[PDB]
Structure 1
Amino acid sequence: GGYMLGSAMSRPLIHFGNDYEDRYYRENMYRYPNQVYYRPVDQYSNQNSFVHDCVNITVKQHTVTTTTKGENFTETDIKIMERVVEQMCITQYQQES
């Protein structure tokens, strides 16, 4: 058993409220996922619990893939990643519903 993929998308435009995070996302955009992993949407009764799992699974997979190549995420990266992935997971739940 694995997870469903989504198709790759352009990393979303996000106006982060924290200005330094806002700039950091742009500077370091390629560090973050452009596609999401998830359990099938018909297994969820609402957007919120889907997105919750989609973010957890996707961040787990990306962090694992990154760590094993000898690379690292900063605490900033993690905060930005969670937001990025949340937006893509919402998109995915809307597109795939």
Structure 2
Amino acid sequence: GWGQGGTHSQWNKPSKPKTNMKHVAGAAAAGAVVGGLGGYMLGSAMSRPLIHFGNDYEDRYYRENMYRYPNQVYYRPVDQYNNQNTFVHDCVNITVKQHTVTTTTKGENFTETDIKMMERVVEQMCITQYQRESQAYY
């Protein structure tokens, strides 16, 4: 007539996490867990992987049992070329340019005029602005 108390356990219990950031790449933030017996595991081999939050009871009576390589993980990869990549390209290859090429041969009595006005061409770009009861003036 024994007794085990109930378990109220948290692998991650953050209370009121107020966080301001920009980039979360390959990481964990704002009270987040990257995988329980998992996550970013490109090549894995797990024998008898068990997750049970409930109570566990075992009454085992093993007699003259021949266990030959139980839960064996024969991890023998050959020439494994696997790609599991995350690519994020934001505001990449942005060009604001004015280019002029001049190639004049034996030019006599000639006038060359190259005017490239560039005014108010881009006012805003990639403005990741979060507003809450706020004001922004540009």
TM-score normalised over the length of structure 1:
0.14
More off after superposition, 34-43 vs 5-14: 5-14
* Count of residues in Structure 1 that have an aligned counterpart in Structure 2: 97
Identity of aligned residues (%): 96
> Matched residues in 2 for 1:85 and 1:63: separation?
20
Instruction: Report if the CA contact (8 A) 1:55-1:85 is conserved.
Output: no
Deviation at 1:27, TM superposition (A): 18
Secondary structure of residue in 2 paired with 1:24: strand
CA contact (8 A) 1:11 1:34 kept: yes
Once the 2 structures are TM-superposed, how far is the Cα of residue 39 of structure 1 from its aligned partner? Answer: 3.2
CA distance 1:57–1:85, shift in 2 (3 Å): same
For CA contacts below 8 A with separation 6 or more, give which structure has more relative contact order. 1
- Number of the residue aligned with 1:45: 82
Unaligned 5+ residue runs, structure 1?
Answer: none
Pick the structure with more helix per residue: 1
Q: Using a 3 Å threshold, how does the CA distance of structure 1 residues 80 and 48 change in structure 2: closer, same or farther?
A: farther
Gapped runs of 5+ residues in structure 2? 1-37
More strand by share: 2
Instruction: Give per-residue Cα distances to partners, 1:15-40, cap 9 Å, x unaligned.
Output: 49999999999999989942212332
**Deviation sequence 1:39-83 (CA, Å, 0-9, x none):** 327623157999999999999999999999999999999999999
Sort the Cα spacing of 1:54 and 1:88 in 2 relative to 1 into closer, same or farther, 3 A.
same
RMSD of Structure 2 on Structure 1 (CA): 32.0
| Alignment TM-score, normalising by the size of structure 2 | 0.12
| Aligned CA distance change for structure 1 residues 7 and 69 (closer, same or farther; 3 Å) | farther
Q: For residues 85 and 41 of structure 2, what CA distance do their matches in structure 1 show? A: 18
* Larger radius of gyration between Structure 1 and Structure 2: 2
